[model samples]
Target: YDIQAWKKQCEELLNLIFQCEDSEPFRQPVDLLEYPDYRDIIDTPMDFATVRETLEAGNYESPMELCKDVRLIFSNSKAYTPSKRSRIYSMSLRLSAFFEEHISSVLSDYKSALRFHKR
Candidate 1:
């Protein structure tokens, strides 16, 4: 798999998803199979069925492992070229913050739901 390309696609898609886009960013397992920027780089598809099953089964750790795989791809690619290291590092930092904010919003919703339940 062109791990780097996949990471980039995830970054873009996550940005859209976090923005509350009405379109489902990931509707099927195959949606995450290839990179949006470089389609030819898709060497293999991620086990989206397993990922979805794990999420549905509340196997949070496994789904988190999937997230880590994306991060690892970006982290590993950051070191591939010295000249682009700084640029990539900066982008990674911003992207990380974006991801955190995205998750924070989700947590906020859960918190609100819990508060309502308590009431």
Candidate 2:
């Protein structure tokens, strides 16, 4: 019966992510001038703005799709940042931890809701 809850929960998680500290770097696309080879190394770049655009476009089929892109943002950060001590690396790690923790509950309930309907 929770037909529309998924979309709303996805949007809610996005808002939390956007407001999280150390999330500024991921709010927009990476600057080519600052890291000219960014695209060269990271094949699929993901950012908050892009996610928001995609979310608004109704292109996402499930909450998991949103999770994939959210995780990708951190993956790209860790991939490009070589040093563990770097702020970017640490921030990515922390942010990733935060997302994983929160998304687990979201996904679990989503799965439960689906099972309820399927039954």
Candidate 3:
């Protein structure tokens, strides 16, 4: 297929694969530090009726791992890759959680295929 057609197909697949919820891949370690995966490490010590500020968010931040995971699957799959751009991104809490909820199913289901994004 032509490059134009390839790009078009890729763009379309992105909509279906991502379900319109895509986060930029972090290009720097500092920016990635903004989203620390405390899940594997220490807890954030949150309790009831708590809404901490952004700076004091959590040790277990959304998109910390899965957020980056989805990006990898997309980039390596058929999506447009920004190989030349500077370190690219943030993931919203609710959205990232929702995203991971679906992707988490892609593995360990036994019957799941490689690129099956039903969401």
* Cα lDDT of model 2 by residue, 2-119, tens digit: 7557788778878998899878899999998999999988999999889988988999877788899999999899889968799988988888898888888777777788889899
RMSD of each: 11.8, 1.3, 17.0
Better of 2 and 3 by lDDT: 2
lDDT (10s digit) by residue, model 3, range 1-119 = 12122223323333443343433332112222553542333223221112112213432133223234434433322222224332221232333455456544333331232124332
Per-prediction backbone clash count: 0, 0, 2
TM-score of each: 0.34, 0.92, 0.24
Q: Give the local distance difference test score of model 3.
A: 0.31
- On TM-score, the stronger of 2 and 3 is 2
CA deviation > 4 Å runs, candidate 2:
none
Candidate 1 per-residue lDDT, tens place, 18-70, comes to 45422122223334334353324434333323434544454543223546544
Cα misplacement distance, residue 101 of candidate 3 (Å): 1.0
Residue 35, model 2: lDDT of 92
Give the range where candidate 3 is weakest over 10 consecutive residues by summed lDDT. 46-55
Each candidate: what lDDT? 0.43, 0.86, 0.31
Which TM-score value belongs to model 2? 0.92
Better of 1 and 3 by TM-score: 1
Query: Which candidate order results from sorting by lDDT in descending order?
Result: 2, 1, 3
Candidate 3 residues lying further than 4 Å off, grouped into runs, are 1-68, 71-91, 110-119
